[PDB]
Amino acid sequence: KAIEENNNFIKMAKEKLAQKMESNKENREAHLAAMLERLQEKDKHAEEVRKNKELKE
Amino acid sequence: MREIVHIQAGQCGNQIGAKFWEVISDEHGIDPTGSYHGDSDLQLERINVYYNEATGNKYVPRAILVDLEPGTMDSVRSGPFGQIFRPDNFVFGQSGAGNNWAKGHYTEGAELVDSVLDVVRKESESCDCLQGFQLTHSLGGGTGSGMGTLLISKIREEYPDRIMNTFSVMPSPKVSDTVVEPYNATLSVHQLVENTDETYCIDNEALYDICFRTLKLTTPTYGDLNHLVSATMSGVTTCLRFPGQLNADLRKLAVNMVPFPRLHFFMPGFAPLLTVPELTQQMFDSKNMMAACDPRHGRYLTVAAIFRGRMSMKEVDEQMLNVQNKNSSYFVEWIPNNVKTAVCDIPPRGLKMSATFIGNSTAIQELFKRISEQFTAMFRRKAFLHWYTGEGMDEMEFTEAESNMNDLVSEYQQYQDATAD
Amino acid sequence: MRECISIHVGQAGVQIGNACWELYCLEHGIQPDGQMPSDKTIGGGDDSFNTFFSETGAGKHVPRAVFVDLEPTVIDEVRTGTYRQLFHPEQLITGKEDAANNYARGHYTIGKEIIDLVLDRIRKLADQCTGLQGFLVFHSFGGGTGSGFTSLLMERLSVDYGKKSKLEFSIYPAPQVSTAVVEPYNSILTTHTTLEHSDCAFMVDNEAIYDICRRNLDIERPTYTNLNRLISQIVSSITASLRFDGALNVDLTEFQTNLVPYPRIHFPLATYAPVISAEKAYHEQLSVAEITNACFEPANQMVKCDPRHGKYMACCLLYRGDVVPKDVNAAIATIKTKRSIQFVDWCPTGFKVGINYQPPTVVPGGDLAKVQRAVCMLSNTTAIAEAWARLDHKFDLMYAKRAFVHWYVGEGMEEGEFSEAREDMAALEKDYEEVGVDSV
Ligand SMILES: Nc1nc2c(ncn2[C@@H]2O[C@H](COP(=O)(O)OP(=O)(O)OP(=O)(O)O)[C@@H](O)[C@H]2O)c(=O)[nH]1
Ligand SMILES: Nc1nc2c(ncn2[C@@H]2O[C@H](COP(=O)(O)OP(=O)(O)OP(=O)(O)O)[C@@H](O)[C@H]2O)c(=O)[nH]1
Ligand SMILES: CC(C)(C)c1nc[nH]c1/C=c1\[nH]c(=O)/c(=C/c2cc(F)ccc2F)[nH]c1=O
Ligand SMILES: [Ca+2]
Ligand SMILES: [Mg+2]
Ligand SMILES: [Mg+2]
């Protein structure tokens, strides 16, 4: 029972840590994905501005 | 995190940068060729933040000097520290902009922007550990206003995890009478709110009022305004430029100063334009604010204060507690210990004791409202839109820039009205 | 054997490490180069001081310690400083980019790049050991590395080393010496995530230490140099039981038995005496009775709280220097009658005592007077929850408006983690409340 419970603590620590570290990497990537996509939305708007100058002449 | 990459965009940006680089080269004991001639180790200990080490012990600014107008290239190269800059880092366009934001942002500046990014990339690739970027510019012009905010958004793409700071010069009818400057500032603010980590509101109205009423000059040139900006910019960079046990980089400072991502518009201040209690009262006084707003008309979310010169630190501790006690209502209760202080041994050239002030106050809305009033005077009657809709823009985007700035003001007000209980 | 591996995380850990190691060297006659002339057994040995120092065949006594930090500037001054020869280069581990006063960068973003290396370097020190007892982890609550990387390390050390004991020397923040507005968040997060993985944690309130350096040492505006020298004496008093041979010496693990009644209740109040300047100490010998009486004066505590308006669960007196049991007993009888020492009904009221004969030493050109005797009281009092409360209030004020929370969310954290940590602290406060209440 001393072994069983020492192992259980090591087991659930290891899994609890792995779960958080993967959750964080999802979140940080999802944050940076949104930031770049809003910046790529600008480059598409700036392509409509430069087309509406040449398609008004 | 040590190396910062400087960018000076437009006429305003290049001249305030020139003055910035003159003062700090002098402080670090660097002559216009670029050799160390000082005495103290402290001048070299964190030299790498602003200077690259070329062959033959040559210290060269990590500056990128950018404009759509030539001629500004000549004035900077002819000026007192023109020789010290890197020749390749000069990246100057052809036909200028002529106080037009849609030229700088969407068309004419967009053509030059890739040749700037090349110089940025070349500078950043050499950095052992790049921390961030600082942009000196005006928000009333065309190039620095528009191409500057494009550079911001473009640098964010290739460096999303570096800090982006701006010394953004706010336009004013008293200094410059160009009629469209309220359009340019409002469009810039729509970018800055989204794409910068902290923006220093260097305001031309306050600089005019200080130069007139304190420094005694009857009608001041741009050189008179810049002596104040270079003093501010020297002060707010002293943390990184000098030792002192402080161990902070652009991110630490931005973490401790910026409690909400959109609310990163600081109110600078300097003192004197002397004993420690006087300094401490002078810097918190509305007359010394380089942005034209009254702290007493709102509340401080956070404050940073840096002191320079030989002085008792016990006295500085007693005095910063003194004004916090005496002015308790003007600091939000729901962020404890939000007024922090550093002290620097080395004073600036000329003054034995100085004191620089950074303040994230909700009163900064008084600057954004003034611009919003000047803006809506012209917009509601559709004035001068042929300058902007000609170069390809839509009326929708003008409404978004007005709406985003009116939200920022509503948010600054929300937290001013917030209470602990 | 009974080896002890010290881990120093972040600026505050690193710099307190310097203070402690420089002090241990002076206590054991170890020179800066690492040699120990009084050590006749070259290359190794089973002596008391070998619990903190391994020996090389060249006679170098090398600290069983790893210094970690996520930026170089602080650990650079150990690599170039007076004790550069004392440490192997592999013991001093740096990154390039710091945690920026952000628990998230320390625990996840920047931290994960260096964590496997740090455990590898701890593992080389662990395989030098024939009977590893555990780890002492020095760090701040408020720093990004001190909070975030420490938590991460502690989680990993529970995996790699099982239930092998882990002690903390945790620096509790104070706005006098801190430039960090977000420390309350970092403190509650690290405290939450470490709680399961630490067996005993000695908190040090920088304000408490600040007020002592002002009051007792007449230092107008104390620096970290001043604070760390004091701290290291308290740390030295606590680790002296592991480092020294003695008849009346009691092991630190024996005190722990008395100090920790339940697993979460592992935060002993420390109090030290005498802290006195050279001027004041001259023609002024402080007896056992005077320094023992000083332990119950709350001005001398490492954490600002009031034991007198709380309840005792343990009281340990760690004496060093010219002290004999007779004098200690006399002093304790005087204190019992004259002072506010109220125990809970479920504990026994006896004071536990240990005596080390090696007298306390001072760092050359310090502020502390060299005294013939000294004492560090480790008591388990419900009063220490006050420290949690003050800090938990600062947390709540900012979190209600989500001030600064974006900086944590941007580096991958959720709001779930914030409130989860606060709820754990709400329970910890409620536990300290519960232990004080009388039985039925
Ligand atoms: N404080 C300060 N303001 C300046 C200086 N030079 C210009 N300005 C202000 O900057 C605003 C106009 O922006 P400029 O920098 O001249 O324009 P630009 O960004 O170079 O754009 P273009 O002129 O279109 O190439 C006006 O409100 C001026 O008062 C200076 O040296 N100091
Ligand atoms: N007692 C003591 N406290 C310190 C020392 N250095 C820093 N602190 C305190 O520690 C807290 C700040 O965290 P640091 O440990 O400096 O930061 P860090 O752990 O290096 O983490 P980052 O710098 O954010 O990556 C503040 O409360 C400081 O006052 C020291 O040498 N001694
Ligand atoms: C007073 C101190 C503790 C140093 C502090 N705490 C939070 N902020 C500060 C001070 C500053 N905070 C800043 O964000 C800051 C900005 C800044 C600094 C540079 F070095 C370069 C460019 C900048 F925009 N300059 C500062 O001097
Ligand atoms: Ca030996
Ligand atoms: Mg121009
Ligand atoms: Mg640090």
Between CA A49 and CA A54, with CA A52 as vertex, the angle to 5 degrees is 115
Out of C223, C240, C268, a domain closes at C268
C156/C22 same-domain check? yes
B307 DSSP β-pair partners: B343, B355
Between CA C15 and CA C147, with CA A21 as vertex, the angle to 5 degrees is 25
C320 DSSP β-pair partners: C356, C374
For chain C, how many structural domains are there in total? 3
Burial class (CB in 10 A: 0-12, 13-18, 19+), B291: buried
d(C-alpha B269, C-alpha B236), whole Å: 9
The CATH number for C437's domain is: 1.10.287.600
Burial class (CB in 10 A: 0-12, 13-18, 19+), A47: exposed
B203 DSSP β-pair partners: B170
d(C-alpha C316, C-alpha C260), whole Å: 12
Token pair for C154: 């502690």
Backbone angles phi, psi at B259, to 5 degrees: -80, -20
Residue B253 Cβ inside 6 Å of ligand 3? The answer reads yes
Amino acid at B15: Q
**Residue B202 near residue B170, CB atoms below 8 Å:** yes
C260/C170 same-domain check? yes
Residues with CB under 6 A from ligand 1: B 10-12, 15-16, 68-69, 96-99, 138, 140-145, 169, 171, 175-176, 181, 204, 207, 222, 225-226, 229
**Residue C85 near residue C34, CB atoms below 8 Å:** yes
| C351 secondary structure, DSSP code | P
How close, in Å, is residue B126 to chain C by CA atoms? 15
C366/C306 same-domain check? yes
Residue C289 Cβ inside 6 Å of ligand 2? The answer reads no
Delimit the domains of chain B by residue range. Answer: 1-259, 260-363, 364-421
Amino acid at C150: T
Asked if A33 has any chain B CB less than 8 Å from its own CB, the reply is no
Task: Give distance in angstroms: CA of C52 to centre of ligand 4.
Answer: 12
**Each residue of B305-340: b (16+ CB within 10 Å) or e?**
bbbbbebeeeebeebbeebbeeeeebbbebbbbbbb
Amino acid at B302: T
Arch. (CATH architecture) of B364-421 = Orthogonal Bundle (1.10)
Find chain C residues with C-beta within 8 A of A14's C-beta.
159
How close, in Å, is residue C403 to chain A by CA atoms? 19
Name subunits touching A (3+ CB pairs < 8 A): B, C
Is residue C89 reached through a cis peptide bond, with omega within 30 degrees of 0 on the bond before it? no
Tell me how far the alpha carbon of residue C292 is from its chain's centroid. 21
Contact C412 A6 (CB under 8 A): no
Find chain B residues with C-beta within 8 A of A51's C-beta.
392
Token pair for C431: 């536990």
**Residue C143 near residue C100, CB atoms below 8 Å:** no
Find chain C residues with C-beta within 8 A of B261's C-beta.
406
d(C-alpha B295, C-alpha B82), whole Å: 39
Cα distance between the two ends of chain C: 45
In terms of phi and psi (left: phi > 0; alpha: psi -120 to 50; beta: otherwise), the region of C41 is beta
C348/C305 same-domain check? yes
C264/C294 same-domain check? no
For domain B260-363, the CATH superfamily is Tubulin/FtsZ, C-terminal domain (3.30.1330.20)
d(C-alpha C39, C-alpha C50), whole Å: 11
* C71 in a known ligand binding site: yes
Task: Give distance in angstroms: CA of B65 to centre of ligand 3.
Answer: 23
Find chain C residues with C-beta within 8 A of B338's C-beta.
181
Is residue B272 reached through a cis peptide bond, with omega within 30 degrees of 0 on the bond before it? yes
The CATH number for C74's domain is: 3.40.50.1440
**Residue C157 near residue C386, CB atoms below 8 Å:** no
Arch. (CATH architecture) of B1-259 = 3-Layer(aba) Sandwich (3.40)
Return the SS3 of C90: helix
DSSP string, A1-57: -HHHHHHHHHHHHHHHHHHHHHHHHHHHHHHHHHHHHHHHHHHHHHHHHHHHHHTT-
Contacts of range B376-379, beta carbons closer than 8 Å, 24 or more positions apart? B376/B402, B377/B182, B378/B179, B378/B180, B378/B182, B378/B183, B379/B183
C285/C332 same-domain check? yes
In 10 A of CB A41, how many CB atoms?
Answer: 10
Torsion angle of C-alpha atoms C257, C258, C263, C266, degrees rounded to 10: -110
Residue B233 Cβ inside 6 Å of ligand 3? The answer reads no
**Among C385, C49, C394, which residue's Cα sits nearest to residue C187?**
C394
The radius of gyration of chain A's CA atoms, rounded to the nearest angstrom, is 25
Amino acid at B400: E
**Among C81, C76, C160, C67, which residue's Cα sits nearest to residue C114?**
C67
d(C-alpha C308, C-alpha B74), whole Å: 75
**Among C79, C99, C100, C69, which residue's Cα sits nearest to residue C7?**
C69
How close, in Å, is residue B253 to chain A by CA atoms? 21
- The contacts of residue B416 (CB under 8 Å, 6+ apart) are B298, B299, B362
Mutate to test the pocket of ligand 2, among C77, C171, C181 (most ligand atoms within 8 A of CB): C171
Backbone angles phi, psi at B306, to 5 degrees: -115, 135
Return the SS3 of B61: strand
C254 is catalytic: yes
Contact B129 C97 (CB under 8 A): yes
Contact C162 A6 (CB under 8 A): yes
C281/C252 same-domain check? no
Interface test with C, best of A15, A22, A23, A36 (most C CBs within 10 A): A23
Contact B390 A53 (CB under 8 A): yes
Three-state SS letters, C97-128 = CCCCCCHHHHHHHCHHHCHHHHHHHHHHHHCC
C318 DSSP β-pair partners: C354, C376
d(C-alpha B70, C-alpha B6), whole Å: 20
Three-state SS letters, C135-176 = EEEEEECCCHHHHHHHHHHHHHHHHHHCCCEEEEEEEECCCC
d(C-alpha B108, C-alpha B100), whole Å: 10
Residues 80-139 of C with CB under 8 A from A: 104, 108-109, 112
Residue C11 Cβ inside 6 Å of ligand 2? The answer reads yes
Output the residue whose Cα is nearest ligand 3's atom 10. Answer: B304
Interface test with B, best of A31, A51, A53, A54 (most B CBs within 10 A): A53
d(C-alpha C343, C-alpha C315), whole Å: 10
Range of the domain at C431: 384-440
Find chain C residues with C-beta within 8 A of A17's C-beta.
155-156, 159
Residue B267 Cβ inside 6 Å of ligand 3? The answer reads no
Return the SS3 of C379: strand
Backbone angles phi, psi at B281, to 5 degrees: -75, -40
Contact B156 A52 (CB under 8 A): no
C332/C212 same-domain check? no
d(C-alpha B303, C-alpha B331), whole Å: 9
C270 DSSP β-pair partners: C378
Find chain B residues with C-beta within 8 A of C406's C-beta.
260-261
C334/C262 same-domain check? no
The radius of gyration of chain C's CA atoms, rounded to the nearest angstrom, is 21
Mutate to test the pocket of ligand 3, among B164, B236, B335 (most ligand atoms within 8 A of CB): B236
Contact A6 C163 (CB under 8 A): yes
The helix (run of H) or strand (run of E) holding residue B7 is: strand B3-9
Strand ranges, E, within C358-432: 373-381
Tell me how far the alpha carbon of residue B7 is from its chain's centroid. 11
Cα distance between the two ends of chain A: 84
C211/C139 same-domain check? yes
* C281 in a known ligand binding site: no
Burial class (CB in 10 A: 0-12, 13-18, 19+), C248: middle
**3-state percent helix, strand, coil for chain B, nearest multiple of 5:** 50, 20, 35
How close, in Å, is residue B336 to chain C by CA atoms? 6
C377/C388 same-domain check? no
Closest residue on chain B to C408 (Cα): B255
**Each residue of B70-89: b (16+ CB within 10 Å) or e?**
eebbeebeebebeebbbeeb
How close, in Å, is residue C387 to chain B by CA atoms? 16
Of C254, C279, C290, C411, the active-site residue reads C254
Out of C343, C368, C383, a domain closes at C383
Backbone angles phi, psi at C370, to 5 degrees: -80, 115
Tell me the structure's resolution in angstroms, rounded to a single decimal. Answer: 3.0
B354 DSSP β-pair partners: B308
- How was this structure determined? It was done by X-ray
Task: Give distance in angstroms: CA of C228 to centre of ligand 4.
Answer: 29
The CATH number for C310's domain is: 3.30.1330.20
